[PDB]
Ligand binder design. Structure first.
Ligand SMILES: *[C@@H]1O[C@H](CO)[C@@H](O)[C@H](O)[C@H]1NC(C)=O
Ligand SMILES: *[C@@H]1O[C@H](CO)[C@@H](O)[C@H](O)[C@H]1NC(C)=O
Lengths: 311, 97, 95, 98, 48, 49, 51, 52
């Protein structure tokens, strides 16, 4: 339903193929690719919000970032540094929220990557993307003369839907750099003025809120207490590399953009065959330069149909 | 699982969606958290690969086959008898012809 | 096939050029013949009136942004009609 | 064509879990044990291999099936209609009958 | 039209060019001015 | 290998325009009534259809 | 025959592609490509006038 | 240039940008027998027809 991007936050993913060909945690993880349009346009879902500043006030040249930090904060950067690639570079032509849209050459993987020079990264998945056509004659690029068939393509309009998504409460995300153990006990080191929970069960189960006060107890191991920051305000999509909250119910819903709509769509015409006449049979002498369908059928009680792609 | 018809629904915006598609989970091994799984090939696109020819070029007796009411319009077979009630005002006398 | 020139620093709702009379269309048949725009060619700076075919300006046309997006410094648009199934381009050149 | 959604896995720190029965499209759950998951900041639990995680998965329709679906039907007993064109003594008529 | 001997001439640069290559025109469907046409494949390179 | 050469189309504004018969290699010439051609500046003919 | 090149002029063509996959008017219409060399060379005729 | 399917030509200024492609089936070609990729340094000298 809603469209308020001052309330949802990007998140770190776990991309299977980073820049060093090793699976790393990356803020540019892609999760779904859709390639059912007739014009070769795809729709990528990344885990970093596009077309919004840090608070989310909708300018069309900045994107939220969800950086790596000892602390846990979000940031932003210029839109010009996001490049989409399959088998060579291709052309971004839309972005709203998570999603974006591009028309890319036939390859085998799908790559999106920030190109800064400060915190540069990439993320690829495999997806059999290749060139498709409409009608019966095959073509390379659409012609300048022919019929007008109807082919379905994606909008480039931002505010059209064909979609629906579930967005809910965030989960606990512990760190190990909130802790120090310089003596036989352990000390919680929160960030500068934050409410940091803990649920430690060395001996017996404990809890509480710590606001920048080094607490100890009867505990001797450096790994038996965890501590995560307590915000619980923003919203994250149910990606399978997060911990769910103990509630985990639907709070809001957002729009998938880029409706799939009908449109008229030009197609080539082929060279009309010459026909010689012989007894109870035609012989049609016919040319093509690309694979082109011929089908025949009788008009009796047995149809006896044929079909072959001749070149 | 693996043919045409492993998704069923009354309408497309309904809720009684019934399906089996051979989804079996696996035990994770790597220290990072994710969930691994495996699943059969989508039988809808497997039908879509080798569906065959449509029946707009396989139907006998040569007729255009519309879709939106599902006609089989304008093909030719057999004889149909009719009987016409001609009004008698459109006749002429044999003393006139 | 058309060609229009919109002026720089345009506001909202300003009439640029009309299409329907140019190519021999009637006003009452535009809604009958399925007059829309082609989805691929739509631009955010130009909406469209679907009943008389006039072409106004939606957002404030900044030259330095779209000059850069398009280094020619032009704009493109396509509209179509569905009862005889015809399509034709409309070009807009901001200066 | 379907769309496998997988909700985020549920991990219980130093305890035990089990799955109920649901009614979504091809629901499939089975628990595990002895995990020790890591996030970007590691050590997401606090006991060495004494805990479980959950793992559930199901499907629903795609956001392109409103154009790309396939309506299965079941036809029987077709009944024919004819448009005619009667002309008798230079006077035409157009008729449509069953 | 479509085999060897598609276009003929006595010399190479002479103007007695008898020819037949099954050229047919098409009525243009775009408002821009251009002349669409279809034609048989080259006979000499299909022989080649 | 031949080389199909197409000269520029003649257009006449609301007058019938039949063509002659010449003796080049495989001459072919047909008329098309009802055109309304467009250059880079539109309306190249002042007489509607 | 002539080579007095100041007596000619370029022109606008009409190309089936353009920079953004549509047929539009363009000053760089390619008329012919001839490909009968023996090292991969290509002779292009455009509508503009180079050199 | 290497083989492909189209022939594009474009001006790359920024004060103006245009391009124009026709589809033209370019494939590589060899001379005589013994198909090759680069002309070798040890070989036989035969007759070619190249452009100037
Ligand atoms: C931490 O929580 C206390 C209440 O438990 C609240 O008064 C305080 O403002 C919180 N601090 C921050 C930085 O939100
Ligand atoms: C139509 O038929 C009637 C008699 O059948 C005849 O008198 C009349 O001349 C006919 N109409 C014409 C236009 O000839």
């Amino acid at each position: 339903i809603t469209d308020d991007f001052t309330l949802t936050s990007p998140y770190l993913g776990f991309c299977p193929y980073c820049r060093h060909s090793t699976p790393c945690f990356s803020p540019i993880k892609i999760e779904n690719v859709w390639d059912e349009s007739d014009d070769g346009s795809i729709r990528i879902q990344v885990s970093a919000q596009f077309g919004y500043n840090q608070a989310g006030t909708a300018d069309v040249t900045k994107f939220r970032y969800m950086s790596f930090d000892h602390d846990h904060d979000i940031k932003e950067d210029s839109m010009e540094k996001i490049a989409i690639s399959t088998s060579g570079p291709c052309r971004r032509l839309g972005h709203k929220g998570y999603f974006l849209l591009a028309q890319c050459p036939p390859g085998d993987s799908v790559t999106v990557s920030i190109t800064s020079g400060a915190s540069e990264n990439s993320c690829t998945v495999e997806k059999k993307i290749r060139r498709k056509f409409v009608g019966r004659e095959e073509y390379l690029f659409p012609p300048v003369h022919g019929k007008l068939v109807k082919c379905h393509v994606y909008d480039h309009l931002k505010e059209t839907s064909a979609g629906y998504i579930t967005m809910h409460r965030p989960g606990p995300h512990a760190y190990k750099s909130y802790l120090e153990e310089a003596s036989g006990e352990v000390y919680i080191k929160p960030p500068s003025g934050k409410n940091v929970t803990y649920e430690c069960k060395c001996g017996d189960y404990s809890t509480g809120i710590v606001s920048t006060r080094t607490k100890m107890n009867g505990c001797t191991k450096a790994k038996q207490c965890i501590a995560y920051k307590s915000d619980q305000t923003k919203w994250v999509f149910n990606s399978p590399d997060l911990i769910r909250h103990t509630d985990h119910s639907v709070q809001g819903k957002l729009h998938i953009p880029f409706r799939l709509t009908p449109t008229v769509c030009p197609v080539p015409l082929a060279h009309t065959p010459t026909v010689t006449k012989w007894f109870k049979g035609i012989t049609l002498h016919l040319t093509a330069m690309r694979p082109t369908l011929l089908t025949t059928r009788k008009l009796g009680l047995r149809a006896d149909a044929t079909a072959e792609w001749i070149t | 699982p693996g043919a045409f018809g492993d998704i069923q629904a009354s309408s497309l915006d309904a809720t009684d969606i019934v399906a089996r598609t051979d989804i079996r989970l696996l035990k994770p091994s790597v220290k990072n958290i994710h969930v691994p799984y495996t699943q059969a090939v989508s039988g809808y696109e497997m039908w879509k690969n080798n569906s065959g020819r449509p029946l707009q070029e396989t139907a006998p007796f040569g007729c255009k086959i519309e879709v939106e009411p599902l006609r089989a319009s304008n093909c030719a077979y057999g004889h149909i008898p009719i009987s016409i009630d001609i009004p008698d005002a459109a006749f002429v006398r044999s003393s006139e012809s | 096939q058309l060609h229009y020139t919109v002026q720089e620093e345009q506001e909202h709702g300003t009439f640029v050029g009309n299409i329907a009379e140019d190519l021999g269309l009637d006003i009452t048949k535009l809604s009958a013949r399925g007059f829309q725009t082609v989805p691929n060619s739509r631009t955010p700076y130009l909406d469209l009136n679907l009943e008389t075919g006039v072409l106004y300006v939606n957002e404030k046309i900044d030259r330095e942004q779209i000059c850069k997006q398009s280094p020619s410094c032009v704009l493109h648009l396509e509209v179509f009609l569905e009862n005889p199934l015809e399509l034709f381009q409309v070009e807009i050149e901001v200066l | 064509k379907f769309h496998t959604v997988i909700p985020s896995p549920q991990v219980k720190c130093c305890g035990s879990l089990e799955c109920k029965a649901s009614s979504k499209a091809d629901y499939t759950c089975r628990v595990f044990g002895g995990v020790y998951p890591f996030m970007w900041g590691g050590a997401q639990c606090f006991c060495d291999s004494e805990n479980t995680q959950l793992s559930e998965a199901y499907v629903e329709f795609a956001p392109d099936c409103t154009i790309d679906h396939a309506v299965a039907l079941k036809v029987h007993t077709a009944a024919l209609k004819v448009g005619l064109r009667i002309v008798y003594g230079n006077t035409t008529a157009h008729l449509d009958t069953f």
